[PDB]
């Protein structure tokens, strides 16, 4: 850990924050290629449609594009609360 | 393209033709460390719940598994027919 990686970390979750529908991210991982990408697990309702949930991580990505100009790529996997 | 890659692609299809619920399988690919390791992609009912397209993939897996012993892990992202 390092002041830098620390900001970053902080400014996902921030964007996080503001879904509601949103829960339990965990395994977040950081990769620097060139000048970063993010990968993570979310966590949503079992009873989640399907089509909503792609709808969701698409909308946090672009969240995620739009507040830092460092980020290159998002993958978010989705999983039932409780795993 | 080598015989061996195909017959294992040949497999995991196979596998996959067996579950009614799944369609659209692509960008399916594989890595060999030490002795392999498939990602998949595979499309499913917008109106699927979260919690049963989990359960799917875990059979998915728990099949591939089966089939083969080579296999050592298995991911699978599920979308909603039509991306």
Redesign the interface.
């Known amino acids: 850990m390092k002041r830098t990686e620390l900001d970053m970390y902080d400014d996902i979750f921030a964007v996080l924050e503001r879904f509601p529908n949103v829960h339990n991210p965990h395994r977040v991982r950081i990769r620097r290629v060139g000048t970063y990408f993010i990968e993570m697990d979310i966590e ?8 909503d ?2 709808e969701l991580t698409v909308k946090i990505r672009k969240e995620m594009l739009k507040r830092r100009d460092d980020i290159e790529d998002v993958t978010i ?4 609360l409780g795993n």
Chains 1, 2 share one sequence.
Request: glycine share 8%; charged share 30%; net charge neutral.
């Open positions: 949503v309702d079992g009873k989640m449609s399907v089509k949930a792609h996997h989705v999983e039932p």
